DNA sequence: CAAGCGCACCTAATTTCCTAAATTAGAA
DNA sequence: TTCTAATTTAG
RNA sequence: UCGUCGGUUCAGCGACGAUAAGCCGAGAAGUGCCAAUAAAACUGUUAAGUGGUUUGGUAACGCUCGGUAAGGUCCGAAAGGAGAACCACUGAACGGAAAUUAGGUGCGCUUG
């Protein structure tokens, strides 16, 4: 529903860098006084301050928290638009709620801010239009009628944003209608000396319903137990075997040492096997119902280089069938036949920690790349062409 | 005199109490303290916002003495949190709270200007023990008993227990010497605290002393370089003999590697595994790794402990009398060196009150060209040749590993001035 | 794999601290 | 009546 | 292979536990979902518009708080038994506590 991207602010539009920088720091410091501030008047609100407060010298009229603090600090941060101070002082009330129980418990001391605060923003004080030079500007209304006519800063502040990659996607549903903006924040970052523009942006989740077209792909890995992957998007999922091991390595020494106790030790082996087929099981599907796919193309089933060593391989199988089809994903058993030996980049048919394309030169987990590479619809067959 | 240490002593059984008794009264304390430090903070917090409303409002600071009741803000903290801490005795309430307002006092202005936070404490606070609070007396037939104050006036005729909390507290080893050092008068006890160990479920005496350091003879003028290196975890050389020490690694992050690995293989485990590790809060699902509590942390102090001891013990036989190394403040060269994670201020810590032990003055340097300063000749080539291993600068042709002539330059006194002068 | 957000959990670097003097209440 | 432990507060 | 005990940490050793990367119980502070309700603030001649507050329910949660194995000896046929009593090795080291800052990691949602 309202998730963040942020968009690094290049340059002001009609101001200097150094002008722009400067009220940024003032306004910096106008919202680190109203965050405090609101935090004591929430103090004393809750009835939480001590005798001496009004007893040798220092009900109030107004009605919610929000309402006594913004009228107090109002008068001192004069220069922050007043959308945007009641805002800011509804994040240090709401916190101080929040926090309300330890705090009188004594759980906790105080909540506290930081020296580079970020600029809280409305939605009515952002707008982004796009100029039709492909060039993305941000429109922001940070100053009051008062604090404009003193820095001479008259209409909004435009900044250009880097609006590049799954942001230009965002960005261009905000502009059409499909997303809408919700708040807004201007974060600054010490470490790359870089202004930042997170905008949170509202809209309706896409309902995944099962298709009988997205394919998601399973590979019987070398280094991990299994390894998921799709076509239709770079998400991945790797059931690793971190527990089979340390399993295998412990009956190891027991049935050394063991030299009944032989016939306990087997019966363990079996549970062991079964239970983690249910959970390996189970994983795959709903790996597979949250992606919205429906089907789920494998391998058909000695120990193998693949990472189970020896297994009830064939035990998972009926358990990967039965959990899928109990939510409508059907199963197709295809032969692995160069699936690990092959590229997934440009169809290069052709250790085993990375694979390495001779031509087109993609580099990543051969684990990963079989899963690809089975999730191709009817990769059996196009394989089979080339061989 | 002049040097302050302290010594986990192992608290096996409480005298007069039953361990479930004992148990329940020290993590009612243990949440007394966790309160008072607490609010404590928030009255500093508080009388910090009333002076700066003053000052707007009526020119001057406001003195505590006149509106507060008190000298200082301790004593006020003291009178609003005795009626609710009331089983702590008072004067480990009193050092409780002490701590709480002079952490406030010491970053006052970091906190005003935002660059702190206020400070906020945990739940498994240790529990304060003064001077006059501790004290031990061994009966004849070897068995050591601490008796402690650990309880007010009105807890003492609630909990039925009319003197001191008596306890069992083994001291074998190295404790043996401290504890006979402190029943004679040679160690001074300072003021002391209460833990509690989660993974052995173990309570220890941690006791606060003072010694006065050995003073060994050693001249001034022989001085020893540390240098953190690529290939070893430190070398030593001296500038007057061609003599040089070196602590080989073997296992550095070998275990640091080996305890990451299975933290995130388990928490990666949880998304799949058993039905009874979802459904009971945060603490039962990151459950696997809370043995892994502190392994990293446990091994690299034991292993810098050793490395430490080692260093000094050189300079102490060679008769080193200063100890020259790098001031990694400026951030130089990480992750290539030798130790890759490893807490190079936990050495470099240990160094220093090990030094003073000894009587020895440890001096840190700018490390500028350190490395690529040939020690023989003297001309800092602004690119060596090699990367590491084998340097060979070409004034002199002097051969020699990376590390020791990273160590023969360090061993140089003021060599920070001559290095400047070397390239302005 | 990557990037936003929310939460908590680890680890490194770094600073400060590791009270006393006087008064009173309870016990022999 | 002495005194040893607990409380209180200045610096 | 990972843990328990042998004064602390690290390693070894002796005995023991282990499907422990496992099993289980109450509850309602937060997120989520459901049903009621609509404050502050802003822009506006008003009207109206933006904004989302408050209460209850539910129990899916990296939701809250908890429980669950591990030296010898002894009683107990055996389970089991009081954190009951007693006994328990070798080497190296043995200055910590709290807080803060910064970085990273994992989980959950969305997107590419
Ligand atoms: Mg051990
Ligand atoms: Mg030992
Ligand atoms: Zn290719
Ligand atoms: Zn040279």
Redo the contacts between chains.
């Keep these: 529903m309202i998730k963040v991207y942020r968009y690094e602010i290049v340059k002001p539009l009609d101001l200097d860098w150094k002008e722009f920088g400067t009220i940024l720091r003032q306004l910096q410091q106008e919202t ?1 006084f109203a965050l405090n501030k609101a935090t ?1 008047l929430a ?1 004393e609100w809750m009835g939480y ?2 005798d ?2 009004d007893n ?1 010298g ?1 009900i109030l009229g107004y009605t919610n928290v929000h309402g006594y603090a913004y009228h107090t600090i109002k008068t001192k941060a004069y220069r922050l638009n007043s959308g945007n101070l009641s805002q800011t002082i509804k994040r240090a009330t709401d916190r101080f709620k929040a926090y309300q129980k330890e ?1 009188l ?6 909540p ?6 970020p600029l809280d923003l409305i939605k009515e004080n952002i707008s982004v239009n796009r100029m039709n030079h492909g060039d993305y500007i941000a429109s922001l209304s940070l100053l009051s009628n008062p604090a404009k006519q003193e820095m001479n800063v008259k209409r909004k502040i435009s900044v250009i944003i880097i609006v590049r990659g799954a942001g230009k996607t965002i960005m261009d549903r905000i502009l059409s209608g499909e997303y809408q903006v919700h708040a807004s924040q201007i974060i600054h970052d010490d470490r790359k000396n870089k202004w930042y523009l997170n905008i949170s942006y509202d809209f309706e989740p896409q309902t995944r319903v099962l298709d009988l077209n997205k394919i998601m792909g399973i590979d019987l890995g070398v280094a991990v137990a299994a390894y998921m992957a799709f076509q239709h998007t770079p998400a991945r999922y790797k ?2 075997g ?2 089979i091991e340390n399993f295998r390595r412990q009956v190891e020494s027991r049935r050394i040492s063991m030299l009944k106790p032989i016939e306990q030790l087997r019966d363990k082996i079996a549970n062991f096997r079964d ?1 983690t087929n249910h ?2 099981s ?2 795959i599907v709903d790996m597979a119902i949250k992606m919205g796919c429906g089907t789920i193309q494998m391998e058909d089933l000695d120990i193998g280089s693949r990472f189970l060593q020896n297994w009830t391989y064939y035990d998972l199988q009926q358990k990967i069938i039965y959990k899928a089809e109990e939510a409508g994903i059907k199963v197709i058993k295809i032969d692995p036949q160069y699936t690990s030996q092959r590229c997934s980049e440009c169809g290069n048919i052709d250790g085993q920690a990375i694979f390495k394309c001779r031509a087109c030169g993609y580099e990543a987990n051969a684990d990963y790349n079989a899963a690809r590479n089975i999730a191709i619809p009817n990769i059996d067959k196009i394989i089979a062409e080339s061989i």
């Design positions: 680190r004591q103090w301050s001590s001496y407060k040798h220092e705090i418990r004594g759980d906790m001391s105080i506290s801010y930081k020296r580079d605060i059931l690793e971190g527990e239970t959970r390996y189970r994983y």
